């Protein structure tokens, strides 16, 4: 069947890896802010690396999660950049998807030489109504099989509205 | 599910299932232990909890105590009784919580001629939550329900201070009317969508405080709980219900189903 098992986007999560703290990170942050209006979140290095030049707890990357309408704008807006062509991977078996773009300017946003250019990670997690069952406090449940988001189902969704192309085998 | 997930014999064999009321995500046993267990030298003295629970839009207040056979209801009031006392709308709001809580206190405290503890359940303790509305009503109602003031709306964060002008306003639905006001000249698209029934019964804001003010009077005047009339018996409800409940099988029937299956699926189509 289908009524009420539509296919909203749960959330879009933009992510910027930066093998260091300091200016170059607070600038990545500045990017995500003005782009989301939400103040973004910082992530510390999990262990120390050396060949990557990072230490445990360094503050190494910012990211931000964005939900409803605002999500769809930035999705499409950067989805543009990618000429509406993803790939057959890119989509998870659990039915979410993502892509990267470098140059965060290729989607509105001026230049400002005291900001630099950054690459971004775009990651779009999909769901249907009643996602709450797996997420609220009381009577936490898991969503029924014939309700779970899948790769087939999400690709077909993407191929449709957006009109964009899938690609590869 | 996923082929390379899936569960071994060994996983299942040694799995220790949690309780059931936990599997159900319904009981915090850690908090239950501490709510229920009594001082060992007060012997058979029951330890009564006031249970407040919110459904998608009915409030439940029972006074409950425990027994190794099952818990035990002394008194129960539901916010869906409130039509009885002149309340028809918003009955999962802070003021219906207060009202219901007052109905619970007055009702039990009646059939008694009383100390009791809040079972919030899984509710978060946020300041202004409405579980605590129930509490105020049961407390203004006459119960001894040990509690502090810093979860009632109008508790100043950045000072140990309660504004009770505000907390009164909640008991009476003041935040609901004030919205209901505010919506009467900034948007009547929405004011007709939600707040619909208030038009449909001609109760505009300003009155909201009186409805509850006299719901209060009405309650103390006759708390004694009217059961619904019923219409159809025990037996009927039972019978019509069995029309819709599948009934298992005999090993004999299952035996055929397989033999039948090896007739089909097997002997070369």
UniProtKB/Swiss-Prot annotation, chain A:
InterPro entries: Ribosomal_uL5, Ribosomal_uL5_C, Ribosomal_uL5_CS, Ribosomal_uL5_dom_sf, Ribosomal_uL5_N
Gene3D superfamilies linked: 3.30.1440.10
Entry keywords, A to Z: Acetylation, Cytoplasm, Methylation, Nucleus, Ribonucleoprotein, Ribosomal protein, RNA-binding, rRNA-binding
Main location: cytoplasm
GO cellular component: cytosol; cytosolic large ribosomal subunit; nucleus
Keyword RNA-binding: yes
GO biological process, one term: ribosomal large subunit assembly
Modified-residue entries (N6,N6,N6-trimethyllysine), positions: 70
Post-translational modification: N-terminally acetylated by acetyltransferase NatA.
Keyword Magnesium: no
An MF annotation (GO) of this entry: rRNA binding
Subcellular location per the Swiss-Prot or TrEMBL entry: Cytoplasm; Nucleus
Taxonomic superkingdom: Eukaryota
PANTHER family assigned: 60S RIBOSOMAL PROTEIN L11-RELATED (PTHR11994)
Reported function: Component of the ribosome, a large ribonucleoprotein complex responsible for the synthesis of proteins in the cell. The small ribosomal subunit (SSU) binds messenger RNAs (mRNAs) and translates the encoded message by selecting cognate aminoacyl-transfer RNA (tRNA) molecules. The large subunit (LSU) contains the ribosomal catalytic site termed the peptidyl transferase center (PTC), which catalyzes the formation of peptide bonds, thereby polymerizing the amino acids delivered by tRNAs into a polypeptide chain.
Quaternary state and interactors: Component of the large ribosomal subunit (LSU). Mature yeast ribosomes consist of a small (40S) and a large (60S) subunit. The 40S small subunit contains 1 molecule of ribosomal RNA (18S rRNA) and 33 different proteins (encoded by 57 genes). The large 60S subunit contains 3 rRNA molecules (25S, 5.8S and 5S rRNA) and 46 different proteins (encoded by 81 genes). Component of a hexameric 5S RNP precursor complex, composed of 5S RNA, RRS1, RPF2, RPL5, RPL11A/RPL11B and SYO1; this complex acts as a precursor for ribosome assembly.
Something else known: Present with 39000 molecules/cell in log phase SD medium.
Family of the protein in this entry: Belongs to the universal ribosomal protein uL5 family.
NCBIfam families per UniProt: PRK04219.1
Name of the protein this chain belongs to: Large ribosomal subunit protein uL5A
Organism: Saccharomyces cerevisiae (strain ATCC 204508 / S288c)
UniProtKB/Swiss-Prot annotation, chain B:
Short name of any one Pfam family annotated for the protein: Ribosomal_L18_c
Organism field: Saccharomyces cerevisiae (strain ATCC 204508 / S288c)
Localisation per UniProt entry: Cytoplasm; Nucleus
Domain of life assignment: Eukaryota
Covalent cross-link (Glycyl lysine isopeptide (Lys-Gly) (interchain with G-Cter in ubiquitin)), residues: 136
GO molecular function, a single term: structural constituent of ribosome
GO biological process, one term: ribosomal large subunit assembly
Protein name, UniProt field: Large ribosomal subunit protein uL18
GO cellular component terms given for this protein: cytoplasm; cytosol; cytosolic large ribosomal subunit; nucleus
């Amino acid at each position: 069947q289908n009524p009420m098992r539509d296919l909203k986007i749960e959330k879009l999560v933009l992510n910027i890896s930066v093998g260091e703290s300091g200016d170059r990170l607070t600038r990545a942050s500045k990017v995500l802010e003005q782009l989301s209006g939400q103040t973004p979140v910082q992530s510390k290095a999990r262990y120390t690396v050396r060949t990557f030049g990072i230490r445990r707890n360094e503050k190494i990357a910012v990211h931000v999660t964005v939900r409803g309408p605002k999500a769809e704008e930035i999705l499409e807006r950067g989805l543009k950049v990618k000429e509406y062509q993803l790939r057959d991977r890119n989509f998870s078996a659990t039915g979410n998807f993502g892509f990267g773009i470098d140059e965060h300017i290729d989607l509105g946003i001026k230049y400002d030489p005291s900001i630099g250019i950054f690459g971004m990670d775009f990651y779009v997690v999909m769901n249907r109504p009643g996602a709450r069952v797996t997420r609220r406090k009381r009577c936490k449940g898991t969503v029924g099989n014939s309700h779970k988001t899948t790769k087939e189902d999400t690709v077909s969704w993407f191929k449709q509205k957006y009109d964009a192309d899938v690609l590869d085998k | 599910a996923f082929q390379k997930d899936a569960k071994s014999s060994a996983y299942s064999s040694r799995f220790q299932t949690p309780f059931r009321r936990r599997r159900e995500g319904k009981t915090d046993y850690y908090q239950r232990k501490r709510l229920v267990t009594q001082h060992k030298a007060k012997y058979n003295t029951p330890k009564y909890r006031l249970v407040v629970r919110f459904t998608n839009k009915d409030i439940i207040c029972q006074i409950i105590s425990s027994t190794i056979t099952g818990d035990v209801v002394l008194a129960a009031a539901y916010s869906h009784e409130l039509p009885r006392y002149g309340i028809t709308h918003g009955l999962t709001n802070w003021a219906a919580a207060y009202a219901t809580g007052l109905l619970i206190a007055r009702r039990t405290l009646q059939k008694l001629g009383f100390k009791v503890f809040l079972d919030i359940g899984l509710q978060r303790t946020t300041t202004g939550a409405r579980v605590f509305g129930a509490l105020k009503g049961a407390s203004d109602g006459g119960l001894y329900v040990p509690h502090s003031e810093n979860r009632f709306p109008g508790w100043d964060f950045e000072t140990e201070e309660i504004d009770p002008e505000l907390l009164r306003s909640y008991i009476f639905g003041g935040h609901v009317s004030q919205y209901m006001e505010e919506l009467a000249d900034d948007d009547e698209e929405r004011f007709s969508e939600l707040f619909k029934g208030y038009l449909a019964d001609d109760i505009d804001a300003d009155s909201l405080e009186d409805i509850y003010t006299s719901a209060h009077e009405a309650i103390r005047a006759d708390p004694a709980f009217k059961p619904t009339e019923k219409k159809f018996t025990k037996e009927q409800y039972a019978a019509e219900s069995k029309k819709y409940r599948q009934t298992k099988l005999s090993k004999e029937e299952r035996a055929a189903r397989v033999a039948a299956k090896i007739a089909a699926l097997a002997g070369q189509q």
